[PDB]
């Protein structure tokens, strides 16, 4: 696991809370064997090109969590300015205004909100970023089509 | 406007009974076309700890178009104009007439986390976010201290 013992206890508390009282459109599926590898699903919000899809993702809690944010991957394929070719979520997404008081609930809200409002100024998917900024309806069409297949 | 009154009533009932996290609605039966709301500034943003009062103005062409939104709490945010008006182009993105007040409110809450400076109504906040993020955040946090 490689987390300080009181951090493991805080993570256990938080994930157990998120299983019992999940945020809207988010589900967490903890594995008690390893709480640092967290499977999550986020519903694509209505009013976005991801509407109707279920987006599987993984959070990896590194040894410095929560001084540092976790790493996040989309396991569901997605056409999103801030999601790289291997599914990695752009590190500035979670680093911006990150403090050690933040946890998994914050990460998950930040990622869900990123589906509504990408940040194309820092696009890892340069094609998706350019389309969003320059021809929004074409970005949306491409993201919708991939959601139809993969979500 | 009759249709507006009918539509707002059903959704407002659900939003009062089962509000989204961080969001509260305060309907006034006298006029359901003008809807007062609060949104908690999310943690992990320059708005953290603030309570943001806002209102929606539902026009006669709702839900073909999104409602107009205003922040009533003063805010330093790329997508919020001098008079508190919330950028219409942002609320229009992927808008269709099956959408309602819940989507609008989630869209605005999530805009506090991820501004869209490419369409900044507040040119200074948009430029600072892109070119001097720490100054943007400092300015927004200081205003949240006073107004939130
Ligand atoms: Na939007
Ligand atoms: Na942010
Ligand atoms: Na953005």
Swiss-Prot record, chain A:
Highest taxon in the source lineage: Eukaryota
Subunit composition and interactions: Component of the APC/C complex, composed of at least 14 distinct subunits that assemble into a complex of at least 19 chains with a combined molecular mass of around 1.2 MDa. Within this complex, directly interacts with ANAPC2 and ANAPC4. Interacts with CDC20, FZR1/CDH1 and VHL.
Range within the parent protein: 6 to 156 of 222
UniProt function note: Accepts ubiquitin from the E1 complex and catalyzes its covalent attachment to other proteins. Catalyzes 'Lys-11'-linked polyubiquitination. Acts as an essential factor of the anaphase promoting complex/cyclosome (APC/C), a cell cycle-regulated ubiquitin ligase that controls progression through mitosis. Acts by specifically elongating 'Lys-11'-linked polyubiquitin chains initiated by the E2 enzyme UBE2C/UBCH10 on APC/C substrates, enhancing the degradation of APC/C substrates by the proteasome and promoting mitotic exit.
Family to which this protein belongs: Belongs to the ubiquitin-conjugating enzyme family.
GO cellular component labels: anaphase-promoting complex; cytosol; nucleoplasm; nucleus
Top-level EC class as recorded in UniProt: transferase
Keywords assigned: Acetylation, ATP-binding, Cell cycle, Cell division, Nucleotide-binding, Phosphoprotein, Transferase, Ubl conjugation, Ubl conjugation pathway
Protein name (database record): Ubiquitin-conjugating enzyme E2 S
Gene name as annotated: UBE2S
Domain UBC core span(s) in chain numbering: 6-151
UniProt pathway annotation: Protein modification; protein ubiquitination
Enzyme Commission no: 2.3.2.23
Gene Ontology molecular functions: anaphase-promoting complex binding; ATP binding; ubiquitin conjugating enzyme activity; ubiquitin-protein transferase activity
Post-translational modification: Autoubiquitinated by the APC/C complex during G1, leading to its degradation by the proteasome.
Record's catalysed reaction(s): S-ubiquitinyl-[E1 ubiquitin-activating enzyme]-L-cysteine + [E2 ubiquitin-conjugating enzyme]-L-cysteine = [E1 ubiquitin-activating enzyme]-L-cysteine + S-ubiquitinyl-[E2 ubiquitin-conjugating enzyme]-L-cysteine
Biological processes annotated in GO: anaphase-promoting complex-dependent catabolic process; cell division; exit from mitosis; free ubiquitin chain polymerization; positive regulation of ubiquitin protein ligase activity; proteasome-mediated ubiquitin-dependent protein catabolic process; protein K11-linked ubiquitination; protein K27-linked ubiquitination
Active site, renumbered: 90
Taxonomic source organism: Homo sapiens (Human)
């Amino acid at each position: 696991e490689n987390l300080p013992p009181h951090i493991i206890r805080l993570v256990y508390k938080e994930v157990t809370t998120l299983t019992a009282d999940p945020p809207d459109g988010i589900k967490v599926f903890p594995n008690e064997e390893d709480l640092t590898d967290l499977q999550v699903t986020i519903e694509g919000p209505e009013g976005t090109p991801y509407a109707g899809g279920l987006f599987r993702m993984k959070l990896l809690l590194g040894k410095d969590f929560p001084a540092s944010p976790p790493k996040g991957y989309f396991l569901t394929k997605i056409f999103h300015p801030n999601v790289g070719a291997n599914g990695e979520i752009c590190v500035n997404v979670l680093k911006r205004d990150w403090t050690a008081e933040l946890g998994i609930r914050h990460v998950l809200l930040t990622i869900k909100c990123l589906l509504i409002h990408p940040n194309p100024e820092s696009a890892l998917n340069e094609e998706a970023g350019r389309l969003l900024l320059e021809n929004y309806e074409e970005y949306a069409a491409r993201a919708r089509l991939l959601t139809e297949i993969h979500g």
